[PDB]
Design a binder for this molecule. Sequence first.
Ligand SMILES: Nc1ncnc2c1ncn2[C@@H]1O[C@H](COP(=O)(O)OP(=O)(O)CP(=O)(O)O)[C@@H](O)[C@H]1O
Ligand SMILES: Nc1ncnc2c1ncn2[C@@H]1O[C@H](COP(=O)(O)OP(=O)(O)CP(=O)(O)O)[C@@H](O)[C@H]1O
Ligand SMILES: [Mg+2]
Ligand SMILES: [Mg+2]
Lengths: 212, 205
Amino acid sequence: KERERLEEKLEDANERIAELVKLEERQRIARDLHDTLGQKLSLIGLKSDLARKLIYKDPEQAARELKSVQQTARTSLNEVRKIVSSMKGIRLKDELINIKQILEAADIMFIYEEEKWPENISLLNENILSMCLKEAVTNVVKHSQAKTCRVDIQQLWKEVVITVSDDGTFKGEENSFSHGLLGMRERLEFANGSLHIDTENGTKLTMAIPNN
Amino acid sequence: LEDANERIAELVKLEERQRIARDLHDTLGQKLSLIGLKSDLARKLIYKDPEQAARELKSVQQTARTSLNEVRKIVSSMKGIRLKDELINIKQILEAADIMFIYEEEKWPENISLLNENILSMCLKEAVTNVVKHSQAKTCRVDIQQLWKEVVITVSDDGTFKGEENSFSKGHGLLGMRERLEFANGSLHIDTENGTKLTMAIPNN
Ligand SMILES: Nc1ncnc2c1ncn2[C@@H]1O[C@H](COP(=O)(O)OP(=O)(O)CP(=O)(O)O)[C@@H](O)[C@H]1O
Ligand SMILES: Nc1ncnc2c1ncn2[C@@H]1O[C@H](COP(=O)(O)OP(=O)(O)CP(=O)(O)O)[C@@H](O)[C@H]1O
Ligand SMILES: [Mg+2]
Ligand SMILES: [Mg+2]
């Protein structure tokens, strides 16, 4: 009714700030890129050209020039190797490993068995999920003081679900949502999924997100 | 707001930043590897077949020039870039001059014409040079504010103004500076009271 009309409106303004902030982003990069890969790539222009001119007039210098070109091609693509490494993102496969290591070295038993694991989930969600995960684990090896920790990750419905439970005690007060907690929620929620918790026996984190 | 705000910020930031890396690799990858290949192949045929070699290098120049342009168009549109470069340029010159550079980004510019940005850059650089030329001051305050419609640099130095009473000789950056701001319908003023003080103004647009 009235509530539907005013949600449509609320979505329109969200999106509007979206496009704007994404733009400002396109930019930080515009400066870095231009600097580096721009001087270099203009130089590639010039040596290309100059090489073509000297092919006959002087095939020696021509060659030497092409040597320098290939050099700068390669290293430039190397710069973007160093660049799409960033925000390329971690895949859970990797985050699970990381955490198995952190839990072992925490003095804690890591309970797992690969259960109905994920396919054709957006790479992005994979990053977020990776994050919340790492944070949850840290919280546990920070306060729970549990000695064992169960975890499963399943493709339920059209929605993916991690669950991370620890036998320790939840050291938090009644409203310590002050911190990777508010962080976690804020996140999943923005991805239109959910985060839930139970301090019944130790601490239990259910993260959910849309997949299929 | 402290965090709902700039947390959802930094998250759409990362949303599209992953998208942006997939586009780098996609576009400039394919392209730049192809540049590798044609470079190489060109070197091989320089003699065996200098014709094909040339043709290959033509296609190379095309691509190298082309890749920069997509990024470049965004850069031309973007504002505040000229001033930032100038600040970096002058901070360096002042440091290396033996001089303290006083600054704090104060109500800095948005949607000023790119042109005015260049002019202002200029007068600025010239002002600085004059200081590190004659003022022999040891510290130098500078601010750049968006005052109402009009933008204003102010560049002050504690040294002494070595100039005579009417040192505004043409072809010197003084007559040059005025000539300029004034042609842009803004203004230039100075005070030799304590050291030297330059107020540049111009229209924001
Ligand atoms: N798995 C767990 N076991 C026991 N206590 C936990 C827990 N997860 C969170 N807590 C408690 O809840 C409170 C809030 O945690 P939150 O995640 O906001 O910050 P933190 O203490 O984990 C450090 P950071 O915010 O840097 O990760 C903490 O005071 C912590 O002791
Ligand atoms: N900030 C400053 N401090 C002290 N003296 C200054 C000054 N700016 C200018 N002057 C004096 O006024 C004169 C005019 O300076 P101006 O910058 O107009 O010409 P210039 O001597 O720098 C050569 P150019 O043509 O390269 O600018 C200078 O010769 C100098 O003696
Ligand atoms: Mg935490
Ligand atoms: Mg001068």
